[PDB]
């Protein structure tokens, strides 16, 4: 089954208040996902919770 966590492949800055910023190499706790990486998921990292592009991470 799907990993609890993912690692960022690229940095993501976000654009709006509910987004989840991170840098390459950061370890994100995945709180909600779909079967698609061509989608946005919900995660927790760097003291925040929010959404991010799923093609920016690799499941651990």
């Amino acid at each position: 089954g799907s990993s609890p966590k993912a690692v960022a492949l690229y940095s993501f800055a976000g654009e709006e208040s509910g987004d989840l910023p991170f840098r390459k190499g950061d370890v994100i706790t995945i709180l909600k996902k779909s079967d698609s990486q061509n989608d946005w998921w919900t995660g927790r990292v760097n003291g925040r919770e929010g959404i991010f592009p799923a093609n920016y991470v690799e499941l651990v």
Binding site: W40, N55, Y56
Partner: peptide, 11 residues
């Protein structure tokens, strides 16, 4: 390469 195109935001 450059960072990739993002998916469309979710509905």
């Amino acid at each position: 390469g450059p960072p990739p195109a993002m998916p469309a935001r979710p509905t």
